[PDB]
Amino acid sequence: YRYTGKLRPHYPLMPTRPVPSYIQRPDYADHPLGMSESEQALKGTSQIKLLSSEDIEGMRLVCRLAREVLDVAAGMIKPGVTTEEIDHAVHLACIARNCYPSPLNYYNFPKSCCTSVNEVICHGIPDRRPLQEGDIVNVDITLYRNGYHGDLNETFFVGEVDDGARKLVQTTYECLMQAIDAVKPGVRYRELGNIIQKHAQANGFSVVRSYCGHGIHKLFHTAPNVPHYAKNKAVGVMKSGHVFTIEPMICEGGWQDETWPDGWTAVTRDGKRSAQFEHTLLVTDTGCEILTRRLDSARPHFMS
Template structure:
């Protein structure tokens, strides 16, 4: 296990490449921010992602990944993840998660953010707040060499305390020259996450998906990608790319204009 994990340890030069990719991805999120509003289609958001990414000489990791047809994922209301941009218009009262991954000189920056469109219900606002807070709480308690399980041991009690649930089928992951690497980063504690550790030089995502109702999911059998809550109630997610350093976790995808730790929606 340790031999396998040592392959993920990045040199200082490689860490700088991951920082560059993370910064680019955060810049893209800030570029999209003013366009995420009522009346805009998710396909239009995807085109913005495409044009910005390729105009800068980067690549969109999701485009063509296991035949995914778009440059980003747009997941509205009860859609947990992997929503495919199309002609759906965002409308007042929606929440939408935008998940973007930019490849810069072969290295991946990965993050997602949930946006409120106009005035949203208290339930949607609360589940967004929970997802955002859980992400930052999980990152804050990471230390060099800690168990991956510390993430789930933080997220699950906090979500349950607020009356929400944590998705188990979809998890965070190692990150680097490849989109998805070991170790798996579940947002609930399990046997493997109690074994795996996060050593300095490892890069990974923390991306809890929080449901207002049941934690159970259902996949769209038609498009093969879209994942929804089984009970149709809303779901929210926030995600950052994180580098473990000798002094603790470093978030690589912080935006300038987006919500910062402690933000209240």
């Protein structure tokens, strides 16, 4: 395999971390190939769930808990720490909150969160590599609690980084937030990409096409599919009681992605850097509720 950048996986991975039996497990957690029966039973479907008042409370709880765990990860970001060490604390943080780390054995994903460095677009696998000063790193957290999934991510700076790094991360965060700002009932899910790409384009960056935002509640990934690029044909119109993520990945170079031999790690084909931010959103009447927002601080971790 020809790597696209300087990054390399650092093996071996430590043995798969166990989740105590008292933690309620999603269906794929015990399927040999990590397949989710309930998600497959809605494959190809474009209809979107309308969340009941108990659904909403369940989503509000699990998303708040997911934010707490990402905050834990944020606190460990410094040169010298390995992505495996991050993952360990995260796994322990989920358990403490009586939640299952949603990525664990999700279609055989071997870890409890995704750690994506530099040219990794998303789905990086936590490994033995020490974070290096100058790196950018995204931690993607998804928790499972009482039948509901909560999903968010932030890109972080590792010590001091360069101007391009600062620009890429700030612009990515802006794309998300401008997208979130347009969310309200009656809006077409396909419009979000127009907004994201418009801002990415104006700053000289491209927008990944192979990965999309998604509905999320009783399923990890479900309807609607939410592309981050312009002129997409996403099916659906926003409604009060809809819950989905927006998670634009933006790149320094071109938009083309490819996957490592591990079957998960998505990297820019040109080896240039990529950044991502993610929130889970609930559409209300006056707009939307950012379920994965910080409660105790105004800004994302990278600008504070």
